[PDB]
């Protein structure tokens, strides 16, 4: 399940981002969706309309995790664009339309300045919150704990960040 990410969103694309997140210990941000505990990923979201990837990666980071007092220590070059398989393509990809056919996201790398304390996973929707439980796990660890739709991504994610691992 390779990608594409391309240092350019190519036409019809979700643009997204994530966000990586890294403690004093090198480890990064692993957060479990509040359903699957098996399931471990760092925070990411999408860019607005017009609006900077840097900062939908620091915004979707908070009104996600609550986690603010964080640094850019590092980010991904290039993007990232997941395209599906023949069969959910025409779920997703033509669910669009006939421009899209996938979701372009770039990752960012963090530091976090501050205290665990901050981090409820929780947000006032109505619906419901995002990740149910949030641990600090290793750059090659939360790959092994994530879910596979993000483990190549997030892998891609930290070689990128592996001068900075």
């Known amino acids: 399940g390779p990608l594409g990410s391309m240092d350019s969103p190519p036409e019809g694309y979700r643009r997204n981002v994530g966000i990586c997140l890294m403690n004093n210990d090198k480890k990064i941000f692993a957060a ?49 664009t997941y395209d599906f398989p023949p069969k959910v393509r025409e779920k997703l990809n033509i669910q669009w339309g006939s421009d899209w056919k996938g979701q372009a996201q770039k990752w960012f790398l963090f530091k976090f300045t501050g205290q665990d304390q901050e981090i409820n996973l929780l947000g ?28 190549p991504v997030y892998k891609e994610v930290l070689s990128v960040f592996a001068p900075h691992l």
């Open 32 to 80: 479990s969706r509040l359903d699957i505990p098996d399931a471990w990923q760092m925070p990411q979201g999408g860019i607005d309309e017009g609006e900077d990837p840097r900062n939908a990666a620091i915004r979707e980071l908070r009104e996600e995790t609550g986690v603010t007092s964080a640094e850019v220590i590092a980010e991904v070059p290039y993007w990232l």
């Open 124 to 151: 006032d929707g109505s619906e419901k919150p995002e990740f149910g439980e949030w641990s600090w796990v290793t750059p090659e660890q939360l790959i092994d704990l994530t879910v596979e739709f993000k483990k």
